[PDB]
Amino acid sequence: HGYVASPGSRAFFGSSAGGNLNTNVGRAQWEPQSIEAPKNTFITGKLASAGVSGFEPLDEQTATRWHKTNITTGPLDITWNLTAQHRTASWDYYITKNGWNPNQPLDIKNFDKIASIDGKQEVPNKVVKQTINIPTDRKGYHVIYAVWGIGDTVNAFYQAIDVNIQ
Numbered sequence: 630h631g632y633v634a635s636p637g638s639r640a641f642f643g644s645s646a647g648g649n650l651n652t653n654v655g656r657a658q659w660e661p662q663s664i665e666a667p668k669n670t671f672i673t674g675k676l677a678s679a680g681v682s683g684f685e686p687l688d689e690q691t692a693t694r695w696h697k698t699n700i701t702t703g704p705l706d707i708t709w710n711l712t713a714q715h716r717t718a719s720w721d722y723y724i725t726k727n728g729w730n731p732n733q734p735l736d737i738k739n740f741d742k743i744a745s746i747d748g749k750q751e752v753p754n755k756v757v758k759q760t761i762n763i764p765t766d767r768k769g770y771h772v773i774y775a776v777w778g779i780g781d782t783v784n785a786f787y788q789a790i791d792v793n794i795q
């Protein structure tokens with residue numbers, strides 16, 4: 630169990646720790662760490678919630694619905710907080726392509742992978758800091774999809790992150 634705290638994930642921003650910068654986020658208000666589903670679950674319109682019961686409000690998609698963190702292209706520091714550390718297989722990061730439609734349901738086919746870090750089947754610390762590169766053809770509102778793949782189960786934790794790139 631864990632979430633991306635920086636840049637704040639869509640779920641994290643729903644919690645008091647995230648400043649309640651997103652409203653009406655269902656279970657994300659209290660447990661943004663709990664978005665757990667089998668690996669390779671990428672159902673169109675159900676990426677933000679990973680299809681998980683109680684997280685449905687996260688799946689709404691418009692250009693103005695969610696709070697964005699202002700970022701630049703190039704290096705971006707990602708910080709996860711884990712409320713329950715687990716042996717880890719992988720960390721994968723995707724971002725929406727230039728030209729994607731922010732008023733349409735999220736579809737993984739409209740993202741590129743942009744980083745992949747091997748967990749080496751070890752147990753990470755409760756704060757995990759990684760650096761990924763944001764490609765320079767991205768400007769404006771984009772969604773980063775951060776995926777923590779568990780080493781000793783068939784599951785992953787899924788974190789949609791709303792960013793405004795300038």
Ligand SMILES: [Cu+2]
Pocket residue numbers: 630631713714715
């Ligand atoms: Cu857990």
